[PDB]
Amino acid sequence: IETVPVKLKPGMDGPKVKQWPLTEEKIKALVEICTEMEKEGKISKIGPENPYNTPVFAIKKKDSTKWRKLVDFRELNKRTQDFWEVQLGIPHPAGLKKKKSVTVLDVGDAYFSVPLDEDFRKYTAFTIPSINNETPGIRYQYNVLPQGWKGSPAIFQSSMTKILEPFKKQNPDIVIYQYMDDLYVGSDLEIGQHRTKIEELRQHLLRWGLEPPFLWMGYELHPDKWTVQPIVLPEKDSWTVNDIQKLVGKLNWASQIYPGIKVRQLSKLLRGTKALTEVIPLTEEAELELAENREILKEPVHGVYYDPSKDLIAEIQKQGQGQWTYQIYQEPFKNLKTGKYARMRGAHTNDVKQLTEAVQKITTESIVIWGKTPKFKLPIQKETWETWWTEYWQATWIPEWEFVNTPPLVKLWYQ
Amino acid sequence: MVPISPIETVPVKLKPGMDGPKVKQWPLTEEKIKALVEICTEMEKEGKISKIGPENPYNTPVFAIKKKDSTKWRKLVDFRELNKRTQDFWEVQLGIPHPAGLKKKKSVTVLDVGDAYFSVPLDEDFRKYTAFTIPSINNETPGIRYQYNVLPQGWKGSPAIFQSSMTKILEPFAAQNPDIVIYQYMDDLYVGSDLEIGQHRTKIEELRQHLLRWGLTTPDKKHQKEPPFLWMGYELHPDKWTVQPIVLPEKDSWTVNDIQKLVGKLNWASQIYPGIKVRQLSKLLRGTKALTEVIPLTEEAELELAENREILKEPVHGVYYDPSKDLIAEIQKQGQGQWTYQIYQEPFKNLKTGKYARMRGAHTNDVKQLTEAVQKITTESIVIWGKTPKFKLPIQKETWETWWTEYWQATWIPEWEFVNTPPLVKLWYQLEKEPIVGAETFYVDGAANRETKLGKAGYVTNKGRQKVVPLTNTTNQKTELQAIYLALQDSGLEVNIVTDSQYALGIIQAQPDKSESELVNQIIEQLIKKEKVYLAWVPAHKGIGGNEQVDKLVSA
Ligand SMILES: Cc1cc(/C=C/C#N)cc(C)c1Nc1ccnc(Nc2ccc(C#N)cc2)n1
Ligand SMILES: Oc1ccc(Br)cc1
Ligand SMILES: [Mg+2]
């Protein structure tokens, strides 16, 4: 109830980000939401002396009919000071990714109970646009901690730890992690049990609150069933020239990741100028080289380490048939995680919706494992992505992304 | 008197670290000084400016200009320096309404609110920065010093602070009168409605009563401006809209500047005149920006000009938006990377038209271009109407399904239906997913010496067919494409091709149907004539048979 002083970083002005076009349905939803936020004192109208702006839109969280306002504070978060005053940073819990059940709760509504430093509010300005710019956009700023701002969990930290103390003391094996507006709660209990402790946890903040519109929801994960993708080679009784060519190609690629990979004996099978569909018997030197390569590929990659000071990078490949592969790394050929999806939901005829869901799942994975979001290299043209991703977005955070315009050969080796 | 509600002041600051202006007042003739003194005395009488003491250290120069063909003088306070030092504001006018998003109105009345413009109070703490000085006669007395109390014309914040003040005054009226629309342009309010003229004229009276609460008087002698309105280059009528007259000049010789202004008019016209084209005319301004240079119009550009003149022969109008009906957008391919479209709700009554041009790129194809045009219309339609139109596209449903399922990128086009109007967008070739049984296998390679630019391209096949061609003024990348071309030229209708060129596979994997490179274009031509093509990649210099043999033939 007393404001924490907040600053931007040195020699850095506030965000001046253009509001992108919003559909009629999202505008009307935001008008209704902001009218009731203004009545509750959460936001106030601002004048033309404030030239700052952050984009806003609206989403529907997974399995909900009600619109949620989502501010894209990515620029403000970059330009906001770093909060290491009381804590250099809560260390990231490495045990969260090892629990059988992790449920994600939207606790962002709790932030609205803390006032925002009156000198910093101007930088949270946003605009509700009108269709065809026929009426002046409605200009607001925040009077309280906004959802999506990196400073909100930091300033509210002190308050959150004290709200959760009774639950943490009574349930010591539970790992609770806070990222932006999300609360990740992991346990090793039977899901029936699990859901009941989550419900117990929801009560602690309704009690303290005494209403949050989305606190009742629950996004359940299972990071111990998480799968990874080692490099595997085909097992065949009949190898065509083409098969062996693809094998040597894949092995050549793997040799950038694994030192001792060899292809000399396998290349030796191709000697001559043969039809691609001709069957080639493996000699025993080629079978041994191949077996030796298989055993190399069952060991971990050498010299792979996470550094919290460097960016995480996520690459995604479209494999077809609703299948997507992805890798997370900081240094080339030093993958920290790899994976594959196929269960993309209600998007059998929409690649962009599938990709958007993959980006969200990968980002969720990254939050649980390292506590931060990766920078995505997306296999999509920027104009297609920018026109549609907001239509399928259901998370309360937004990662960073760049566009891949040249087809990678590596797609073949991850399929 | 009747109490008036005051206009609250917007707090204004100078840019951080910047102080106010201190600009020397230029010497003036005795006749301009007496003109400025009388002008400023009446401004002072009206509360616009106030005389200040000598303590204020700031100053902005003032000038006297003759309204031409008049013995009347006019004041000009040059705020250029203060504007450089004044903070940035929020600008609402950046987005201009598109006429095609407006709604039909039976009546539109115009009200003059100039009284309000020159009567919005200025932040008390900022007034000092607006100080100016009338020089004294013969410089024998101190100049007369004044500062502004109202919003100064020519000051950076005056347009934004006026608009915001007016909007705040009007919001209660608009909210409680949802049957009318109000728009502020310059010092005029435009009020439109569908009501009966009497119910409408009452609303106007009511709006005048509301404005009088802030002391804002509106001329009783109603405005002279009436439909049609000339606005932002458009003509607005009650039930239709268009662009102001587009007149393409006759010229025996054309210069850079003339072509720029011709293309500008064509671009402006293309939002309601269907089919406008500007590719060949824009090609003339490639690279060069010497406004006085003459460029001979090519035959292609004369045809495009002639085609545009016949499109612009006679007026065309757009209709307004009916929210109760769906939006339809239809696209046609025009050639040379040009696309045109029309957006309508009832047949033959366009809301607006437009065009899209191929983005700069080494290689491209029609499907990618059609996709980009759809995204552009989608985004434009969200802006103007807040919704995506249903699309009518010259591409078969089967062609789109094959393209999206097999393309290496994610891609998507919103709800659409095939419209069978040539030229249709199609896939010109499709590579095989598996090697072809019974088809000859061509192992291709090329190489070039980086010094002399001498190279070789060629192939060897499983049937013993071989070719190597010596090349001049070439590069490794060019010889790799030439090798693939030779394999296509010398093979039958089905062919397997094995290359080690990552460069060549990057290009072909992108599925171009036309290219900047005539060599890629020759490859595309050959691909189109095949029945089946399987392209296989192998890593170089790894002892792979076929690939090893031809590599040594070409790098010799
Ligand atoms: C943008 C705008 C410019 C002018 C005018 C600016 C100037 N000069 C006048 C008005 C009233 C508006 N605002 C809106 C809002 C919604 N529908 C309309 N439809 C509409 C507007 C004018 C005519 C006419 N004639 C017909 C329909 N206008
Ligand atoms: O009374 C008013 C005069 C001008 C403006 Br702008 C707003 C209110
Ligand atoms: Mg070679």
Swiss-Prot record, chain A:
Changing residue 61 to E: Strong decrease in RT binding affinity for all dNTP substrates and in catalytic efficiency. 100-fold decreased sensitivity to ddNTP inhibitors. Changing residue 183 to I: 29% loss of DNA-directed DNA polymerase activity. 46% loss of RNA-directed DNA polymerase activity. Changing residue 152 to A: 74% loss of polymerase activity. 56% loss of RNase H activity. Changing residue 163 to D: 16% loss of DNA-directed DNA polymerase activity. 24% loss of RNA-directed DNA polymerase activity. The record marks 388, 401 as: Essential for RT p66/p51 heterodimerization. Changing residue 251 to S: 17% loss of polymerase activity. 30% loss of RNase H activity. Changing residue 163 to T: 34% increase of DNA-directed DNA polymerase activity. 18% increase of RNA-directed DNA polymerase activity. It comes from the Viruses. Changing residue 286 to L: 68% loss of polymerase activity. 10% loss of RNase H activity. This is p51 RT. It comes from Human immunodeficiency virus type 1 group M subtype B (isolate BH10) (HIV-1).
